[PDB]
């Protein structure tokens, strides 16, 4: 779900507006420089969490045009030569090309979750502290509850990416060993 994720985005954009609003509103003397530190922290995670968003959408259809690339070559030798393995070797660059950006995906995911981490540690303290105001600690720990999710999602759709590109490595191969043995 691009929509459901980027609902999510657009509404932790909105929750990241009213923190910073919320929080210029204190006087110089309510550890309003502290809790600042925290907010814009979550703007930083907020940047990543659309930055990871952008590449994994684009990565995502890489992957689902290289499957229909492989498809019709299954296909074209179902109806059945050199042209044939250039688009093979195209095939199998495109997929490494996938697999380092794919590469990417994953060192920028784990930053995220780090400096996620981090955060709920940062927040946990702040949480039991009384004299913090109210309203903008609960804006703080609802963006935190929505970076959370989105990560979460973002996880979940980078693994299944990981594995996609597992499994046309796998089905370009088959493509390349019927190849062979029709050679022989």
Same mark, same amino acid.
């Given at each position: 779900?691009?929509?459901?994720?980027?609902?999510?985005?657009?509404?932790?954009?909105?929750?990241?507006?009213?923190?910073?609003?919320?929080?210029? &509103?204190?006087?110089?003397?309510?550890?309003? @420089? #502290?809790?600042?530190?925290?907010?814009? !922290? /979550?703007?930083? %995670?907020?940047?990543?969490?659309?930055?990871?968003?952008?590449?994994?959408?684009?990565?995502?259809?890489?992957?689902?045009?290289?499957?229909?690339?492989?498809l019709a070559v299954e296909r074209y030798l179902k109806d059945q030569q050199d042209k044939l393995y250039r688009e093979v070797a195209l095939i199998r660059a495109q997929l490494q090309k996938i697999e380092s950006e794919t590469l990417?995906?994953?060192?920028?995911?784990? &930053?995220?979750?780090?400096?996620?981490?981090? @955060? #709920?540690?940062?927040?946990?303290?702040? !949480? /039991?502290?009384? %004299?913090?105001?109210?309203?903008?600690?609960?804006?703080?720990?609802?963006?935190?509850?929505?970076?959370?999710?989105?990560?979460?999602?973002?996880?979940?759709?980078?693994?299944?990416?990981?594995?996609?590109?597992?499994?046309?490595?796998?089905?370009?191969?088959?493509?390349?060993?019927?190849?062979?043995?029709?050679?022989?």
């Amino acid at each position: 779900y691009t929509s459901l994720i980027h609902s999510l985005i657009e509404e932790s954009q909105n929750q990241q507006e009213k923190n910073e609003q919320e929080l210029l &509103e204190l006087g110089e003397g309510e550890a309003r @420089q #502290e809790l600042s530190g925290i907010v814009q !922290k /979550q703007n930083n %995670l907020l940047r990543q969490i659309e930055a990871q968003q952008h590449l994994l959408q684009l990565t995502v259809s890489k992957i689902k045009q290289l499957q229909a690339r492989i498809l019709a070559v299954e296909r074209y030798l179902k109806d059945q030569q050199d042209k044939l393995y250039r688009e093979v070797a195209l095939i199998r660059a495109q997929l490494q090309k996938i697999e380092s950006e794919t590469l990417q995906l994953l060192h920028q995911q784990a &930053e995220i979750e780090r400096e996620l981490n981090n @955060q #709920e540690q940062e927040i946990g303290s702040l !949480k /039991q502290r009384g %004299l913090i105001d109210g309203p903008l600690l609960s804006g703080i720990d609802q963006q935190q509850n929505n970076l959370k999710r989105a990560i979460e999602a973002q996880k979940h759709l980078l693994q299944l990416t990981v594995w996609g590109i597992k499994q046309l490595q796998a089905r370009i191969l088959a493509v390349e060993r019927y190849l062979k043995d029709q050679q022989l």
